Amino acid sequence: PVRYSIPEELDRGSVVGKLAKDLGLSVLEVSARKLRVSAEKLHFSVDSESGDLLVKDRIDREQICKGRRKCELQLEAVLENPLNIFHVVVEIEDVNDHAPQFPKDEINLEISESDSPGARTILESAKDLDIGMNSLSKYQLSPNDYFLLLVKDNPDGSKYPELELQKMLDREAESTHHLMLTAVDGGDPPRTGTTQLRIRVVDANDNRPVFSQDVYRVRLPEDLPPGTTVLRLKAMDQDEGINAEFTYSFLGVANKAQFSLDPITGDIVTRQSLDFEEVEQYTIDVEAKDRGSLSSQCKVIIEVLDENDNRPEIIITSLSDQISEDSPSGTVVALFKVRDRDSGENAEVMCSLSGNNPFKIHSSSNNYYKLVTDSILDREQTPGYNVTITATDRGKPPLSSSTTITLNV
Amino acid sequence: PVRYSIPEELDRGSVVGKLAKDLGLSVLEVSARKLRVSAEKLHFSVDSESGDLLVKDRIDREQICKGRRKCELQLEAVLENPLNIFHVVVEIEDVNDHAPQFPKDEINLEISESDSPGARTILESAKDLDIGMNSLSKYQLSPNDYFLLLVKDNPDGSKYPELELQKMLDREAESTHHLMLTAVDGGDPPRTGTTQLRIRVVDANDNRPVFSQDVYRVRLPEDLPPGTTVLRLKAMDQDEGINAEFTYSFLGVANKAQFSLDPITGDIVTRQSLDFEEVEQYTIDVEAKDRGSLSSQCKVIIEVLDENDNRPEIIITSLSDQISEDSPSGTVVALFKVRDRDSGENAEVMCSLSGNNPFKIHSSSNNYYKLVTDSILDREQTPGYNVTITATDRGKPPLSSSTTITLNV
Ligand SMILES: *[C@@H]1O[C@H](CO)[C@@H](O)[C@H](O)[C@H]1NC(C)=O
Ligand SMILES: *[C@H]1O[C@H](CO)[C@@H](O)[C@H](O)[C@@H]1O
Ligand SMILES: *[C@H]1O[C@H](CO)[C@@H](O)[C@H](O)[C@@H]1O
Ligand SMILES: *[C@H]1O[C@H](CO)[C@@H](O)[C@H](O)[C@@H]1O
Ligand SMILES: *[C@H]1O[C@H](CO)[C@@H](O)[C@H](O)[C@@H]1O
Ligand SMILES: *[C@H]1O[C@H](CO)[C@@H](O)[C@H](O)[C@@H]1O
Ligand SMILES: *[C@H]1O[C@H](CO)[C@@H](O)[C@H](O)[C@@H]1O
Ligand SMILES: *[C@H]1O[C@H](CO)[C@@H](O)[C@H](O)[C@@H]1O
Ligand SMILES: [Ca+2]
Ligand SMILES: [Ca+2]
Ligand SMILES: [Ca+2]
Ligand SMILES: [Ca+2]
Ligand SMILES: [Ca+2]
Ligand SMILES: [Ca+2]
Ligand SMILES: [Ca+2]
Ligand SMILES: [Ca+2]
Ligand SMILES: [Ca+2]
Ligand SMILES: [Ca+2]
Ligand SMILES: [Ca+2]
Ligand SMILES: [Ca+2]
Ligand SMILES: [Ca+2]
Ligand SMILES: [Ca+2]
Ligand SMILES: [Ca+2]
Ligand SMILES: [Ca+2]
Ligand SMILES: [Ca+2]
Ligand SMILES: [Ca+2]
């Protein structure tokens, strides 16, 4: 079988080979014996003047050999009187007329933010119908910090790219990445096909809901009626959607007796009345946690302001029913103490007597006062005496309590 | 004012201090002068024999002083004939009888696996009713690789512990962590209160569903009836529950026209019949993605096996209807070739004549046959001839086509 090697995509009329000269026939025999050439799906023309094989149709190697590495066509030469048949093998060389191209212009991707480094994603394969060196050679990707491109060859023999993640993604810093991907063949000069991949990072629950303040400080008067909304907590979750829906809760145990907390709204209200004498300061550990159990905690301290709601109490320690009227000057008559549960200015007290009696007030020790008689009296002058002592605290509103004592001579 | 310092929680009858020895009163004067002691709602007893100050009630510093940093009680001593009043101050020393303790014995915690390192979680504060050095001193945590303990102070002055995570958690490696937290006061000897921290690691979607094989390869004959389950993909997600429910989908484009994939069962089935002459091999990129966007991809490769389903067709290239009666032996009369779309042994063919005709077969090359006449015949014997050529295929089951041609002399 005579063999003729020609490249594909040759213009009509180009010469394949001297078929008549190779067969040993002359122009006279080519004209006399009807010379025809027959292929499977191709047609060739032979002119009577030259007697050589000329191309009659456009030959696309990728159409006929369709990925066969070595390409050949089986032609037949028919002659008449006497009719005879001959076989010609024509090897078709590939030309780099087809550039690599992607199935889609843009590739849209979704990569989870929680994707571990080193993870790989398979990308769309670039197709190059050419074979051999003119086929697809390598892939290259635009430079970036996150993705490094790998070229793997699938079982058929083609080349497909996959992405190896170098660093963990973070949509809270960069939501999406737009990259340019190129595929180059091994030609001279080589050809490039480009697709622009648009990667979208979906939210991953990797950010905890953080409060606006690490510590919240409020001040309240103890006369605050229960049910009042004392505070509204502010917190934000840098994530998105499910990963950003959080609730507030009382981390402290048994401390919900004095305060109530709406978990969704994050506001703290008073369950019951506050008493400065009972609890002066509150410390509440409040937590914010999303549906993914990511939580951050902060402390809310509450300062209760003292109000003058407790009247001062007089407690007579001891008293002498019978005393002498002609007793010496400054004679002690009764011993009593003044106690007030309040604190600060609400605890300071001032007490006074009537003044008509000869008795006078004196200060001996803290929270204790002695009632004495500065001037002696006659039993005939005044046998019995009633005295009303008033103890008033000056913090607003000032409050006073009185105690009436009877002394006999 | 005489001052006597005694620790709290001393048994009744214990001596506070020799008040008479400091005052210099005599035993006879102790009996004569009624010596009385009066405190704020507290009672102390003095026996006439010794003449010293003895306790009559139990003294609990935390109950009466309720957290005062320095606590003292003001008692009063009364004598008769001559009646006198004196002031005595009793400083109550604190005793380390209350150990620090947490509000709850066990603390149950939920920490997301995706919690970043260095994150801190505030824990419940330990309360110590003692005041001063005997109060709470420091916190310490059981040793482990994951959590490091920090001691921080809230505005009131108390001490609360918070946990700083040293290394990333992993529920797929360790589901839960059980730790012991202790709070120690500054006493001699010091006392410890313990709370049991039970940390449970909540699942985070940090594992992508991985296939049982990176590439799946199956081989199929083209006569495979559609609807046949060609493959069943196997993949697992190491996460838990929602984060582990994934589906399979055809990531490859336009290749779903010939194949269908049940996502729940993970089944790959054939939509339509396969043809070896059309497509020899299929390559489909299939993806598996959970309820998040964590996805893994794998390649499925299908090799189509050629079956003898196309019968060979005989095509007569050329023929001379009229031939000379005096034609010699071996005179060529017809040219024909056999075409079979199949490949391999399914493409090899064998042709035969009727046998009634005198003609014989010759081969010009493979799949091309020349019909000649081996023995000369007389025109008067047989003018015309019908000959039916049979072409049989060698692939099992063999397929044959016949073609009848007529020759006239
Ligand atoms: C054989 O050829 C003759 C004419 O030469 C024709 O009449 C006859 O029908 C043919 N045989 C068959 C089976 O048709
Ligand atoms: C794509 O890139 C290649 C080099 O890799 C060029 O040769 C080609 O022309 C196209 O610009
Ligand atoms: C692919 O496409 C890019 C533009 O998107 C070109 O710059 C490149 O040379 C190749 O043709
Ligand atoms: C503040 O918010 C509470 C609900 O948390 C209300 O009950 C209150 O009346 C105020 O609006
Ligand atoms: C708890 O631990 C402390 C030391 O950390 C001891 O001093 C205490 O008595 C208790 O055992
Ligand atoms: C609390 O309890 C633990 C045992 O559960 C002790 O080891 C610790 O010293 C503290 O007394
Ligand atoms: C394989 O599995 C598929 C599941 O749809 C079936 O339809 C088929 O018949 C074979 O059992
Ligand atoms: C050729 O042979 C096949 C059997 O292989 C027949 O079915 C056909 O009719 C022809 O005779
Ligand atoms: Ca071409
Ligand atoms: Ca080409
Ligand atoms: Ca090319
Ligand atoms: Ca993030
Ligand atoms: Ca996020
Ligand atoms: Ca979150
Ligand atoms: Ca009050
Ligand atoms: Ca008050
Ligand atoms: Ca008051
Ligand atoms: Ca005690
Ligand atoms: Ca104590
Ligand atoms: Ca203690
Ligand atoms: Ca994990
Ligand atoms: Ca996990
Ligand atoms: Ca998962
Ligand atoms: Ca077929
Ligand atoms: Ca066949
Ligand atoms: Ca076939």
Automatic annotation (TrEMBL), chains A, B:
Chain positions recorded as Ca(2+) 10 binding sites: 325, 378, 380
Binding site for Ca(2+) 8: 222, 277, 306-307, 309, 342
Residues annotated to bind Ca(2+) 1: 8-9, 60, 62, 97
Record-annotated Cadherin domain positions: 44-102, 103-211, 212-314, 315-409
Coiled coil segments of this chain: none
Residue positions with a glycan: 192, 194, 229, 386, 400, 402
Binding site for Ca(2+) 4: 113, 170, 172, 206
Cysteine pairings via disulfide bonds: 65-71
Subcellular location: Cell membrane
Residues where Ca(2+) 9 binds: 308, 310, 340, 342, 346, 393
Binding site for Ca(2+) 6: 205, 207, 237, 239, 243, 290
Record: residues binding Ca(2+) 5: 113, 172, 203-204, 206, 239
Binding-site list for Ca(2+) 3: 96, 98, 128, 130, 134, 185
Residues reported in the UniProt entry to bind Ca(2+) 2: 8, 62, 94-95, 97, 130
Residues the record lists as binding Ca(2+) 11: 325, 380
The protein's name: Protocadherin gamma B7
Encoding gene (name): Pcdhgb7
Span of the entire protein shown here: 32 to 440 of 929
